[PDB]
Each structure stands twice: as structure tokens, then as C-alpha cells.
Ligand binder design. Structure first.
Ligand SMILES: [Cu+2]
Ligand SMILES: [Cu+2]
Ligand SMILES: [Cu+2]
Ligand SMILES: [Cu+2]
Lengths: 98, 98, 98, 98
């Protein structure tokens, strides 16, 4: 089970960490930390063939500390993730599935 | 009128109870309890023929204790429900309509 | 300018009032009162020909007291409005435009 | 980096300022100020050819003071922006890109 914080303790508009490697079917926990609001959008152009980006995204805004979104990915490959609100700020990450 | 709590008192990411039987036209009350945020998504692949899953879902995030969503189902059958945010955590239920 | 409260002071899941008459171009103010969350959905099957129900709706959840949504309607006729979350509870209204 | 406040200090349902000029690729910061909730919708009929209004919008409601949405625009032209909730109130702005 991998943990990714949304917003840095210093208030940076980043995924912490912004690079992670998980096994297929391994739980990924996104925990709302700082710099609200955030969301988790899987990039339409940077997910494996056959994966439905819209289904794995979590678009509604996370506006409170400690809120969690849990996902499991099964198709191996790299996945580009970004936070819509803070896209302009470079708030994005890469998830590698094995 | 059936009551289903969103999140366990212990903070489990579950529908309590996760199995319920209601009559057609009987009110179903979903009450936000713990482990925010939650939502109520009727599974496209597990609802009766003719039911419009999108119309009975309530996709916007419930972020506060005591918030209520009220639904009435009229087509008899079983309905698979899940919480998008916590899908990865197994937060799902079954509603049987008579 | 017409005022419609979302939720009764007693906590009823109602539009107060649930019947109103406004002039074309007259401001309609929806004020979040009690029994959160609420939204304002214009019924696809009960709005005048040519009106785009999706454009006049305000679907994101209103979760705080005092929040306001302002609309102006120009096509004369009756408009059926409902609160998605509390549809099961009979939380609906009628707006007559002149 | 341009700053635009959502809601006036006096509680007016306005973008402050409601007219701004930025360079292509320059960061635009929308900061939630007063008169919640607000959102940022780029007008389908008033953005440059080729720009995807839906991608640059930020439709989920901003319900707290200090929340920030960051955008970067690269296609030169004028862009009409409005706040859905307060459209009826005249809460709109113009962004000129160079
Ligand atoms: Cu973010
Ligand atoms: Cu949940
Ligand atoms: Cu309501
Ligand atoms: Cu606004």
C-alpha cells in the first residue's frame, strides 16, 4: 500500500512523492495534506491502452486535511497524474505499475 | 424508510449495513457518518434493465457528518452501489428492491 | 429580485417558497439555509422549449449557510426545479416566468 | 504572475480585477476571497479558436478563503470568464493574452 500526500507540509502544490512504483492490485492511498483544494486526474494521453482514465480519476475537490482516495491499478505501465486546480503550478506525478 | 450510514463509527470505509432489502418506492436515507468524503454511485453493470444509473447516483462528495441523500427505487432487482473515492478500499453495497 | 431559501428553518428538505412568479430577466436568489447539502436542477422534461436545462442548473453541492446562487430566466413558461440529493424527499419547486 | 481575487472585500460577486492582461505562459492565480461559492468557467463562445474551454475551466466550487486555482494560457486573444453560481449577478471577467 503506497501513500501519496496531496500538498507539501511547506504548502508546496505537489504530490509527495511525485514518483512511485507499485505492484498491480496494490492499494494506492492519496491523503489530503495541505494547499486545498486538490483532485486526482489521470491523463488521457498518458495511461496504458485500454485503461479508462475517467474511471480511475477522482475529480471532485478534496477540501479537508486527512481525506483519502484509494485506488488499485492492474494494467502495468506508467500513468501520468495531475491536480486540475493546480495544473498551472506543475502539480503532477507519475505512477509506475508492474 | 431504510437507513444506511456512510463510514463506520470506527472509521471503516463501509456502507453500514452493506446489504439491505427495501420495498419499491420506500425511502432510502444515506447518512454521512465518518471517513469523508463519500459518494453514492450506482454501478452501470449492476442495476436492472431500464434503470438509468446516472440519475439515481449522487456523485458530488459528501464532506460533513449528518448530511443526507434520499432515494426511492421502483424497479425490482438488485443494485450494486459503490463509493467512488473509496472504491479501492472495497466500499460497496447491495440494495435489493421488491 | 426573488428569494428562495434552500431548507426550512425547521430543517425541512424544501424550497421556501416552492412556488414563485418572477418577471423575465428578474433576479432569482437561492440562499442556502438548512439541511445541507443542496443543489438546483432544472428538470429536462419541465422547462420551456429552447431552454437548455443544463446551463441554468447549478449542480455542485451547496454545503454552507448563506451561500447564494443567482439566476435570471428570460423565456416565459413554468420551470420544474428539484434538489438532486433530496429528490427522494420531495424537495422540488415551480418557477413561473412572465 | 497575475492575481485575481474571487469576491470583493466588501462581498461583491466580482472578479477583482475583472480585466487583466498577461503574457502567453504567464501564471494566473485565482484566489478565493469572499462570497462563496465561486468557480471559473471559460465561455465556450468567447475563447480563441482551438482552445478547449472545458480543459481550462475549473468547475468544482471553491468554498473556502485562500483556495487557489492556477492556470497558464498560451493562445493569444481575449477570453471571457464567468462564475457559474453568480452568473445572474454579473460575475464575469476578461483575460487578454499576448
Ligand atoms: Cu492541487
Ligand atoms: Cu467513501
Ligand atoms: Cu436539498
Ligand atoms: Cu461566484
Amino acid at each position: 500500500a503506497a501513500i501519496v500526500k496531496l500538498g507539501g507540509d511547506d504548502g508546496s502544490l505537489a504530490f509527495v512523492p511525485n514518483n512511485i512504483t507499485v505492484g498491480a492490485g496494490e492499494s494506492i492511498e492519496f491523503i489530503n495534506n495541505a494547499g486545498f483544494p486538490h483532485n486526482i486526474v489521470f491523463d488521457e494521453d498518458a495511461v496504458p491502452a485500454g485503461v479508462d482514465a475517467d474511471a480511475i480519476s477522482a475529480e471532485d475537490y478534496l477540501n479537508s486535511k486527512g481525506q483519502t482516495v484509494v485506488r488499485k491499478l492492474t494494467t502495468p505501465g506508467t500513468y501520468g497524474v495531475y491536480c486540475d486546480p493546480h495544473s498551472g503550478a506543475g502539480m503532477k506525478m507519475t505512477i509506475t505499475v508492474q
